[PDB]
Design a protein around this ligand. Sequence first.
Ligand SMILES: Cc1ccc(-c2c(C)noc2C)cc1S(=O)(=O)NC1C=C1
Ligand SMILES: Cc1ccc(-c2c(C)noc2C)cc1S(=O)(=O)NC1C=C1
Lengths: 112, 115
Amino acid sequence: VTNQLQYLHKVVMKALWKHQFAWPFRQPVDAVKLGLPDYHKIIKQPMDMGTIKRRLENNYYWAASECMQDFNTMFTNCYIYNKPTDDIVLMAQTLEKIFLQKVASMPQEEQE
Amino acid sequence: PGRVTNQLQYLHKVVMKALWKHQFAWPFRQPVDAVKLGLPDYHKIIKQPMDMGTIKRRLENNYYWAASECMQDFNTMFTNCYIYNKPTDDIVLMAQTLEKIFLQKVASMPQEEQE
Ligand SMILES: Cc1ccc(-c2c(C)noc2C)cc1S(=O)(=O)NC1C=C1
Ligand SMILES: Cc1ccc(-c2c(C)noc2C)cc1S(=O)(=O)NC1C=C1
C-alpha cells in the first residue's frame, strides 16, 4: 500500500467506476459475446477496470505507475482495436480525460 | 490565456525533454504531413491533429492554464496514432513505448499546481 495507490483507488477508480460510460470497461472484453473473433489476435494484453479494481483491493500493485500503465493499456487497447467512428472510442476518451485530470493531482512522492 | 506553474515546468523540462530525445520520437516531433507521407484520408479521420512540437511551443508560449490541459494534448497525440494506423504498424509500437514513458514520468510530477 502506498499514498499514490490509495489516491488511484479512492479518487481515480471511484470516479471512473461509477461513470455512465464505464459499463463496457467494467469487465474483460468477451470476444465470443461481442462477436469479435480477431480481438485476441490484435490485443495481446487485455485489461479492464474490474481487473484493476480487484488488483487495487488485493494489494497487487507495488507502485502507482504499474496501476497507471494498466489504465493506459485498457484505453490504448480500445483505440487500437476499434474503428475511429465507433462510440466506444468516444466513451474511452471521456473516461481517459477524467483519468488524466485526476492523475494530475496525485501525490508526487510514493511513500509506502 | 495561460500561466507558468511548477507542474507545467516539470512537463516541459522533465517529461517533454525525456520523450523528445527518445529514439522513437522522430515521427512525433512535428505535425503529421499527410501530403508528404501520402495519407489523403488522414485529416478526414483525425480531426484534432497534435504533435510534441505543437505541445512544446504551447509550453514555451504559456498557452496552458493547467498541467492537465498539456497532458490532454499528449493524450490526443498518442490516441490519434492508435486510431488512424493499423494495429500492426511500427508507429503504433513506437507510440506505446513513448506513452509508457510519459505516464512513468507524470507519476513523479509535483502534486499541487502552484503559479
Ligand atoms: C459492449 C462492449 C463492450 C466492450 C467493448 C470494447 C472495449 C471496451 N474495448 O474494445 C471493445 C470492442 C465494446 C462494446 S460495444 O459493443 O462497442 N458497445 C459499447 C459502445 C457501447
Ligand atoms: C514517417 C511517419 C510520420 C508520422 C506518422 C504518424 C504519427 C506520428 N501518427 O500517425 C501517423 C500516421 C507515421 C509515419 S510512418 O510512415 O509510419 N513511419 C514511422 C514508423 C516509423
